């Protein structure tokens, strides 16, 4: 019949006070003693103290002394418990218990229904979201990659964990963990297991971890456990001839390795097939300063090298192995030593014909005998050192196993005519030094108006079997350039049918030059009325151009009728016949025997 009746639940605030009643029935109140016990989740039950209804004697616990007060009403058979200065840690279920018998109060067999007391707030600190990534790439058959999101500094315990993709798609493979209290604050973590194929093929670089809390919702990006992949090579660095003065004739060689994402590498030095570990100092692999993109790193390696074997040209190869692949490099050689130089550099000046026809003054620097074409650089510089624009062109991989390059620059006619000096500068990785040339215009020249004569093949020497050869002789022109062209039937013939020679100087007529131009015909079309002209264009000519002509016939100055061609046969025949008649009449005369 003994039963304990308690008051209802109450929601209090920090600093306030709570009061709970404990009605006892079915037994003598002044006989048994009542005690108050509070049971909080995650903690052992705590006895707040016992109260004696007879006389009001009470005994409160040391931890609750000064804040807990116990009273009771003998007539009403009800006990009271007052707890002032409530806090967040005081939130628990308050129940009143009585001993099974009056002799032993510790045997709490009868207990009340309990009056929960909730104390909201007190700290009010929102959780902070921290991303969690897998630390070890497990070598097992893991078809999914594990990622996590850790929430810390949460004063209360109420967190809802959600995971969403970049496309706002919710992740259903989420696994939450129980909240853990650390230093008066609750910490909770959530993990989401996403498929490896989805991470390796999806364009979403990170997952969105959403945590909902009463003090404010928080979101944090969770990057996937992936990195870039391309690190692998290195470069070597030699010191100069002056650089070997560490003491007696010593220096160090430097190898640099960069463009490395995945950290795992191995650095080593080799010399003619043996691993070198002497004087080798390896630095850490630090991160390159990149605003965005791959997280490639960089490292420099150093060997304290000696010059004695460097004079012996002992090799040094710097290698690294990354992503299961080995890279290689071995610094040596005396800056591409000699006995391997074969390059032809021709600086072609602009002719007068090209200037007067195409109106452009294009300096040209033809380079041949090349073995490769990666490093060649042709630069046209003016006389005063100011570089002129140039447009290199590499093509025509000749059967001679060499490549040809040309760099053409355009200049104004005024500067070229003034006598300025232009210097082609060819530089290449197979050369020890730049290969300079120079062209200019010989301003100190005169004009002397060449004379063009066109010659027949040969009186009867060439013209006996085939293949005649007519020459166009040009003599006397002073300014050392000319341009002869051959035409046949009103049309320019072909540049590959005739050969014109350079303006060589002359026999005794100082100051002027001469040239030639031969053309070859088949001689079945020479005694067949064909006509060839030789058009010669020179600067000193009155019209800057002229032309001559030979066909098969020398010349003539008559009208073909004022030479008496149609009557001469008649005159010859009549005079023969009448001379014979006179030679018969003379005898008839001389024979007369006149008395």
């Amino acid at each position: 019949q003994v039963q304990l009746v308690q008051s209802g639940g109450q929601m209090k605030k920090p600093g306030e006070s709570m009061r709970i009643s404990c009605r006892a029935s079915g037994y003598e109140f002044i006989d048994c003693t009542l005690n108050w016990i509070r049971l909080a989740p995650g903690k052992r039950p705590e006895w707040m103290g016992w109260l004696k209804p007879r006389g009001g004697a009470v005994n409160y616990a040391r931890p609750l002394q000064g804040r807990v007060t116990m009273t009771r009403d003998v007539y009403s058979d009800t006990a009271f418990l007052e707890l002032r200065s409530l806090t967040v840690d005081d939130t628990a279920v308050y129940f009143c218990t009585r001993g099974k018998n009056c002799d032993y109060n510790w045997d709490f067999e009868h207990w009340g229904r309990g009056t929960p007391v909730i104390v909201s707030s007190g700290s009010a600190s929102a959780p902070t979201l921290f991303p969690l990534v897998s630390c070890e790439n497990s070598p097992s058959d893991t078809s999914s990659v594990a990622v996590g999101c850790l929430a810390q500094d949460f004063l209360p315990d109420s967190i809802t964990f959600s995971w969403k993709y970049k496309n706002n798609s919710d992740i259903s493979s989420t696994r939450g963990f129980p909240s853990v209290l650390r230093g008066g604050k609750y910490a909770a973590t959530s993990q989401v297991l996403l498929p490896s194929k989805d991470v390796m093929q999806g364009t979403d670089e990170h997952v969105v971890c959403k945590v909902q809390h009463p003090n404010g919702n928080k979101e944090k990006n969770v990057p996937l456990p992936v990195i870039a992949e391309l690190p692998p090579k290195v470069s070597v660095f030699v010191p100069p001839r002056d650089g070997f003065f560490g003491n007696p004739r010593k220096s160090k060689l430097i190898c640099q390795a960069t463009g490395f994402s995945p950290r795992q590498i191995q650095v080593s030095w080799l010399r003619e097939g043996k691993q070198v570990g002497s004087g080798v100092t390896t630095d850490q692999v630090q991160a390159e300063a990149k605003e965005s993109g791959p997280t490639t790193y960089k490292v420099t390696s150093t060997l304290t090298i000696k010059e004695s074997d460097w004079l012996g040209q002992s090799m040094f190869t710097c290698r690294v192995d990354h992503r299961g692949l080995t890279f290689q490099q071995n610094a040596s050689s005396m800056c591409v030593p000699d006995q391997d130089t074969a390059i032809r550099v021709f600086a072609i000046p602009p002719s007068f014909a090209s200037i007067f026809l195409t109106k452009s003054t294009k300096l040209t620097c033809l380079v041949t005998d090349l073995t490769t074409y990666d490093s060649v650089t042709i630069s046209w510089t003016r006389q005063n050192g100011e570089a002129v624009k140039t447009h290199t062109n590499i093509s025509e991989s000749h059967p001679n196993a060499t490549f040809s390059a040309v760099g053409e620059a355009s200049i104004c006619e005024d500067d070229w005519n003034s006598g300025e000096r232009f210097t082609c500068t060819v530089t290449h990785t197979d050369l020890p030094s730049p290969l300079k040339q120079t062209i200019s215009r010989p301003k100190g020249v005169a004009l002397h108006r060449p004379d063009v004569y066109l010659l027949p093949p040969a009186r009867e020497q060439l013209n006996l079997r085939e293949s005649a050869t007519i020459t166009c002789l040009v003599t006397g022109f002073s300014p050392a350039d000319v341009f002869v062209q051959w035409m046949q039937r009103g049309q320019p013939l072909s540049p590959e049918k005739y050969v014109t020679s350079a303006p060589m100087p002359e026999p005794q007529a100082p100051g002027r030059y001469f040239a030639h131009s031969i053309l070859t015909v088949s001689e079945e079309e020479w005694n067949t009325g064909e006509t060839y002209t030789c058009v010669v264009a020179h600067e000193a000519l009155p019209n800057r151009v002229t032309e001559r002509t030979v066909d098969k016939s020398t010349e003539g100055e008559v009208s073909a009728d004022e030479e008496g061609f149609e009557n001469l046969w008649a005159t010859a025949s009549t005079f023969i016949v009448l001379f014979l008649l006179s030679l018969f009449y003379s005898t008839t005369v001389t024979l007369f025997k006149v008395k």
Partner: protein
Amino acid sequence: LWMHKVPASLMVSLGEDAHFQCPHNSSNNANVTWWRVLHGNYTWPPEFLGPGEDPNGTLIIQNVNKSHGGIYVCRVQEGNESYQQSCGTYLRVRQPPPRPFLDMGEGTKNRIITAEGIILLFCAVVPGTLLLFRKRWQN
């Protein structure tokens, strides 16, 4: 269409006057210009020789000599449209021969030589035998 109607050649002697013409049918204000082009499908620009003097673009080359041989071509153009170009007038030069007798052709000289031969033979044969018979008959 005044092209195709210009003479195909001009005959002139060294140290003499050469008169060209450009007989266009345009509206009596066209800018005539006289050029000197090469033979056929050339590649070099023509030699501007100046406008016509005045009447109908006539060109007057004076003291003609051996350098002046070539094709001469007008380029009549009215207003702003494209020029229309004469075909050419090949100027050729030579020194004309004189002749002491009254030049009497050449075939005429051969014909007269033959005629005089015949006449001379007959005037030799007839009187000769005539007077040789007469004397012998007289004797």
